[PDB]
Amino acid sequence: MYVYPPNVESSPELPKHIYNKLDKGQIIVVIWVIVNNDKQKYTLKINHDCVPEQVIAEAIRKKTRSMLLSSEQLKLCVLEYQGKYILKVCGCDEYFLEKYPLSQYKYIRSCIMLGRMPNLMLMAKESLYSQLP
Ligand SMILES: COCCOc1ccccc1-c1nnc(Nc2ccc(CC(N)=O)cc2F)c2ccsc12
Ligand SMILES: [Mg+2]
Ligand SMILES: [Mg+2]
Ligand SMILES: [Mg+2]
Numbered sequence: 001m002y003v004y005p006p007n008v009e010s011s012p013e014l015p016k017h018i019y020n021k022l023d024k025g026q027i028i029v030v031i032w033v034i035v036n037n038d039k040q041k042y043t044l045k046i047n048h049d050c051v052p053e054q055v056i057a058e059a060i061r062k063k064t065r066s067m068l069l070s071s072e073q074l075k076l077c078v079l080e081y082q083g084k085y086i087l088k089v090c091g092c093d094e095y096f097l098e099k100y101p102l103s104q105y106k107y108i109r110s111c112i113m114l115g116r117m118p119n120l121m122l123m124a125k126e127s128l129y130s131q132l133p
Helices: 052-063 071-084 106-114
Strands: 026-034 039-047 085-089 119-124
Touching: 026 052, 026 106, 039 052, 052 071, 052 085, 052 119, 071 085
Parallel strands: 026 119
Antiparallel strands: 026 039, 085 119
């Protein structure tokens, strides 16, 4: 399947009416995973200008909390695993595959403007791969 380029606004600066809806610079996002095809979710508070791999890193921080990792161990774990996953907008064929502040992706900026909760699916990066012809 082909993969579209990031669906982003032209600049990372927020228009003032959107900036002023931030909560101390932060937003809340819901991250879903398929585990049976049963679903599980995390709800995470993040800086609005976190890039997609930093969202994945924060999910890794939550998933590994019971391991009582040091910061150095968590960094090692994040470096090993964050690149194995990708974020997709729930309900459509749009992914967050490049380094932009999350609030520059049009879906997220729209969610902030509307006071809607972004819902994202965390998937294996291999789900994107095409077979060579
Ligand atoms: C193999 O999992 C798919 C990839 O998952 C991840 C990869 C990177 C960062 C976070 C996760 C991740 N993990 N667990 C999540 N909820 C979850 C909680 C408990 C279980 C059962 C168990 N653990 O006994 C299974 C689960 F799924 C969630 C929810 C949102 S992100 C995420
Ligand atoms: Mg404030
Ligand atoms: Mg949660
Ligand atoms: Mg979906």
